[PDB]
Design a protein around this nucleic acid. Sequence first.
RNA 1: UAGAAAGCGACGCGGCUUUUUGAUUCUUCGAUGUCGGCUCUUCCUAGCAUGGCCAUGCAGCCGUGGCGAAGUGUUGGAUUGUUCACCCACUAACAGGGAACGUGAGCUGGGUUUAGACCGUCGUGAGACAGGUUAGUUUUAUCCUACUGUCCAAACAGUUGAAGGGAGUGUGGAUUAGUACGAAAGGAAACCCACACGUGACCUCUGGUGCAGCGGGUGUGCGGAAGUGCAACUGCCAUGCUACGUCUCCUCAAGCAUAGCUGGAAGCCUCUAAGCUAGAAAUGAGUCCUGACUCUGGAAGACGGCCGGGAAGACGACCCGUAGUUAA
RNA 2: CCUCGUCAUUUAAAUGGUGACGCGCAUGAAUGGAAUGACGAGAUUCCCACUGUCCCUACAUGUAGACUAGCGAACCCAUUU
RNA 3: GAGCCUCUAGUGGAUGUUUUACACAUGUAAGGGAAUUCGGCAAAAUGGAUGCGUAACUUCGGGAGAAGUAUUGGUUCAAUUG
RNA 4: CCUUGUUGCUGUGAAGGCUGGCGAAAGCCAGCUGGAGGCGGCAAGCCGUAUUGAUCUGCAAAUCAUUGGCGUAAGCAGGGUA
Lengths: 141, 65, 383
Amino acid sequence: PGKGKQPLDAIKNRYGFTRGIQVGTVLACADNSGAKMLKTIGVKGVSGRLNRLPAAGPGDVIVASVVKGRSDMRKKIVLAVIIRQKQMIRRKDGVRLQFEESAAVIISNKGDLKGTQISGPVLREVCDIWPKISSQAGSIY
Amino acid sequence: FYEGTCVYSGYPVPRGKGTYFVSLDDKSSLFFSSKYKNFSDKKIKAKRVKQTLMSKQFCGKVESV
Amino acid sequence: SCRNYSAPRHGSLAYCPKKRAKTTKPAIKSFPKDDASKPVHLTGYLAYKVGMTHVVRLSTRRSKTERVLKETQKEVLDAVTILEVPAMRIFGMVGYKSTVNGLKAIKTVYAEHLDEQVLARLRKRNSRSSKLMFKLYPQKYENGDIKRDYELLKRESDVVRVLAHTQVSKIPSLNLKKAHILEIQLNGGTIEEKIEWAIERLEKEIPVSEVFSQQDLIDVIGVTKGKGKEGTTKRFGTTILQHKSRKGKRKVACIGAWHPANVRRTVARAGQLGFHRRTAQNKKIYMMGNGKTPFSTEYDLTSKTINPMGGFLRYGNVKSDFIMVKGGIQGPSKRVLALRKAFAPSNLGKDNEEIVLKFVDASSKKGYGRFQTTEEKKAYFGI
RNA sequence: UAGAAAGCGACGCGGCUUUUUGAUUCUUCGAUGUCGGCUCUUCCUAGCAUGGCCAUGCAGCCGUGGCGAAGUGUUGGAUUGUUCACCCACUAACAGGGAACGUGAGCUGGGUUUAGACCGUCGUGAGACAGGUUAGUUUUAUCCUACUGUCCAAACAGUUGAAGGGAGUGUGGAUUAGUACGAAAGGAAACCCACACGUGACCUCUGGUGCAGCGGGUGUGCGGAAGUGCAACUGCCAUGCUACGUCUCCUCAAGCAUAGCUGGAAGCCUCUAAGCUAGAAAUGAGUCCUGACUCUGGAAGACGGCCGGGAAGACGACCCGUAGUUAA
RNA sequence: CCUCGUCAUUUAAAUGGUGACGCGCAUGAAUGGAAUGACGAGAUUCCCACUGUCCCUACAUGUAGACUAGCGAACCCAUUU
RNA sequence: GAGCCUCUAGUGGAUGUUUUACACAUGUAAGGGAAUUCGGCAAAAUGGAUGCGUAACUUCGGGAGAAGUAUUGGUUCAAUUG
RNA sequence: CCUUGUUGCUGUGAAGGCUGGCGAAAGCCAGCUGGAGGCGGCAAGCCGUAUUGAUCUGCAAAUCAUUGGCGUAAGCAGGGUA
């Protein structure tokens, strides 16, 4: 539900994959918007329990701050979608996948993309729930 | 039913075993096990690993294309 | 003072005290409600745990409200357990009467001829016996005592159950010469019908196909694996303490307040873990078959038995009839289990769907198994 | 916006609580270890979320005031020794408290409060300062009782069920539907599917581990090679164990608040004075775990040790075998 | 003292650090005042590398410990718990 | 005359059992990388020799091994210390 | 205070000296030789920072492990004397 600053209006179904990315993780930005590295500060949809750090998998929306990028863009808070992950995932058909490096892509409150082109490969399941990503990805797996 | 053929070893992979590794070059590749994935990372040439189907074909111990 | 932050309890109090089970063989203690509107039928059976494998099935399950036009079909990979079920033999019956103190047994009646395997349960040490066990009982057939006995059972009873034993000599890997004995309830019809149905079948063999069929939901009762004496970190799941502490980190730090001046039964302590009775409800039968008849799917046109290359690790090859069920089951290989018809029917959509298999894995369970049959291994290697 | 009372409620008046700080000195000075955090359990209600309802200045959406209810929840961080405070991020929501200001023979030792030393202010001085600063030893259960499991009281085979325990909770998407309702702007209401946290099990797959097994090299020993010690390094990996893996979790009955039916008192009226109907995440049962006293059966021998194993194990105990698909 | 002083910089967020300012409860000149180099098991803040400190724990080794032969104490004690 | 391995010369006992939990000395770990805590306490990482290349400030002596980077085994040869 | 014992391996490279170049002079720049210092890294030793580790009915009325500080010198030590 939409509360606080930077609310999200476009909620989607989670997949139950392993959660490789958590608060504290620094990861690359894959789009052409001008950010380069993002530092993870929160995850949408997490209600929390004692002593556990919030974590995310592919398809989930993270809150992050821009730690490398153009001057206009640094030290600001932003929303992004996780498109690939280095931790292993299992499909319901039993196939297992693993990428070389993790990455995310920046979005608006309405779920629209910030940039126009995405570097490198993207996970098939993400393109099923975020249809706009299908248009501008490098390859689908 | 098979999952495919392992990239490094040449071995056919049974359904429901092994893993795909996807590089930033955009290629997807299938490995039989962690053993042979690690040998790729460490740049061991497959033709020198004498139990592999690749090595046996190269030596002419096994008839191939 | 109140504690600083909220958190849930560690472990469930539904299973405390967690003591060790008394013997390894379970009785079915509860049976589904009788209904006089149906034919006479049995309600349970005994089985032995063989091992696990995996299968691929086709599916088409989706939300009824999903707007997608196409009849999408999808492969799913699932893990399964195999149980061996040789035919049981009927050897007697018991009648019970209802009282203000529950059900009480009136009399028990046995068959004229009994097997060496069942008489062996009655003695303690197998190899030291005079074998004068049931030798005088057959006279009761001549005397008409049997005919007086049936009259009393038929006259004054509310519930009727048969006695059945299992043919252990068919499963050599058990190293066992004494049969297991179970008391099984009959539902349907009237007391008279139940008694006549039983009388017709003393000394005979009932196959598992009498009791269960494919796609049915069943309850499985068994005793879990044993793990010895264990600490609180494993027995109840409590967190490990700070790294620089003296006198040990793997413990509950505080076991009570000053008042009351005693330890409460709700606090975690070290002790026995594992070897307890547990019942798993609503497991579904994927397949039923026989250990030495080959089978095929619509898609896998190979013809093979259920047995993997080299057999199951400490068991060997299945020979009798078998059941295959979804998911994992209590206890290690070789333990006895009790099977029961489901106590009540399920409303969940995941339970009530059809099952269509396309592949079953038959590769070796020792090491990395990479062939499905000896023919493939002989073709991969030379000659 | 009319109007005491939807919501408020001046000036005055009566109570309850012990969670704040005072007031007093009854108990302990041949000693009851003193602040905060960590860990873990239970209780209270003055109800923050989640369920059922009543009023409204209740069109709808969002709210506000009240009633029965304590089953399940109430988080991750930055500065600070802090309880407290104040900000950032998430959330259905981030309510408030008690148990010797719960908890040091459970830990920790940052603060305070022995002996060293610096600064400011006071003192002729030795020295002072709920002013600031830095360094400063955390002992012992083998007794009794509680608590957790284990054996005996209880021959062997099959059972019974007194009594005790108890468990599932919540979020989202789709559809109803851009519908009702509204001038417009906006904008609701089952069934089905995905997930998180909690609970109980399991190794087919995938990670992890390397005791058994196979290989490799460095320094130095056994005249060389082969087989190898010691110092230790290193690649792979059976069985097993494990989670970062896989499977798992609803149905009756009596009825709260309320809203109703029939109906007198009191020819009318009226949910109540008798009687009846619908009714909550609450209560009591069943399915789930433990198993008191019992009940039914076989036979002149039965049972224990000793010997050998494990699917079981601290020791007992449990599951099994002994002239055989027995062992080597 | 008031006090977690005000303004700037460092963080997503600063009872912290550094830079400025000054009617300074109660700074200050051999009761020695001020600005640096080289050297401290001295006190304090930040960045890179690195990691079982942590999320969240799992498996394995040696030595004790349990059971057994030989040997064999003490603290403490109104005691009926 | 470091640590590690050998020659001369010298050396040893509370018994059996594969042995749970909790300890005390140690190893290894997916993805993340100080989120832990008063505080990076403990651990990990770096490490010898040869070459290239080295800042502010300074009492001109130093800073300085600054930082940052590359090379290294066996064999068979040339050339004579490179 | 008197008489004695106890310095092994390595790095850096002051004063003084010899060649070659530049300069009208004064004196500047290279390469080599030389080996100073309460100067650096270590050994034998002397000490006592951390783990607030082990032990606390101890091996011990102050010990043990790993980790640390100095080690060509206002350093350490035996006997005689005050």
